[PDB]
Design a protein around this ligand. Structure first.
Ligand SMILES: [Mg+2]
Length: 287
């Protein structure tokens, strides 16, 4: 998160080699951190809580008596970033059979993520089945067919206007014949959220009964990504998130605000498992 990393590092760096710092020195730093977070598109309330968390913790660490307050602030900011990011790494719970939905807008990288996820679990010994569930657009189904072909994972393409009941029947049949134990359903991706889309997704959910509903989000959209996350959760109901294009995000607002705003864990980063602790370190220039 380029710009956030630099600002945070410069802020902590300013207190380096000054001996003990004053009360206003601390407040100044806290103000630099707050401004750094707002610019990174971190939610207003999340930013507010972050700065207070660092204040309370640092004071608890006797920061004003410290001869190396910069180290105390460093550790405190690291801890706050780690927690904001999710705290500890989390992954979906696999069982005998699993059917998960991959939901998100067109452009979130939902379809490529579906294939990437299948390859990831195949490597762990699972037998995935990709399901191209867009009942209106053949091109979207073809894209996943091609992707599955490349990653060596089977793809079931629904037909135009196929009912949720027919989709369930065919999916169940293929899974039985091919001993598939992880079904990844790539739902319809559209440029914007419209009620008809959400209604079909909600219906498809009632019929297929997925164990997990993964919302794929383009990290580069910032807070907007969480607005989308709220909508999808209210209309369909999500269980976890996948943030793509993290390398392009010089900010980090979405990743840093997700837990607080949505209450949903970030399972994967666009692809490998999401590691809060590892990213908190990289943000501070140590990763
Ligand atoms: Mg219902």
């Amino acid at each position: 998160f380029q710009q956030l990393s630099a600002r945070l590092q410069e802020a902590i760096g300013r207190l380096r080699g000054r001996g003990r710092i004053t009360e206003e020195d601390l407040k100044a730093t806290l103000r630099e951190i707050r401004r750094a977070l707002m610019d990174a598109d971190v939610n207003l309330e999340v930013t507010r809580d972050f700065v207070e968390r660092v204040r309370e913790e640092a004071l608890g660490k006797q920061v004003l008596e410290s001869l190396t307050p910069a180290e105390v602030i460093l550790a405190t900011v690291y801890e706050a970033l780690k927690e904001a990011l999710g705290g500890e790494a989390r992954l979906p719970v696999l069982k005998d059979r699993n059917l998960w939905f991959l939901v998100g807008l067109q452009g979130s990288g939902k379809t490529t993520t579906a294939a990437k996820l299948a390859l990831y679990y195949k490597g762990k010994g699972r037998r995935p089945l990709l399901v191209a569930a867009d009942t209106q657009r053949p091109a979207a189904r073809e894209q996943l067919r091609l992707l599955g072909e490349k990653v060596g994972v089977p793809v079931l393409e629904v037909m135009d206007g196929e009912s949720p009941e027919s989709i369930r029947r065919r999916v169940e049949e293929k899974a039985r014949l091919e001993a598939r134990d992880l079904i990844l359903v790539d739902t319809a991706g559209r440029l914007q959220i419209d009620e008809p889309l959400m209604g079909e997704l909600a219906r498809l959910k009632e019929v297929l009964g997925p164990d997990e509903v993964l919302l794929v989000l383009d990290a580069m959209t910032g807070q907007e990504a969480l607005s989308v996350a709220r909508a999808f959760d209210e209309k369909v109901g999500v269980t976890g998130l996948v943030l793509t294009k993290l390398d392009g995000d010089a900010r980090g607002g979405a990743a840093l605000s997700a837990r607080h705003v949505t209450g949903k864990p970030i399972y994967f980063a666009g692809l490998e498992p999401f590691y809060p602790e590892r990213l908190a370190g990289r943000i501070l220039g140590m990763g």
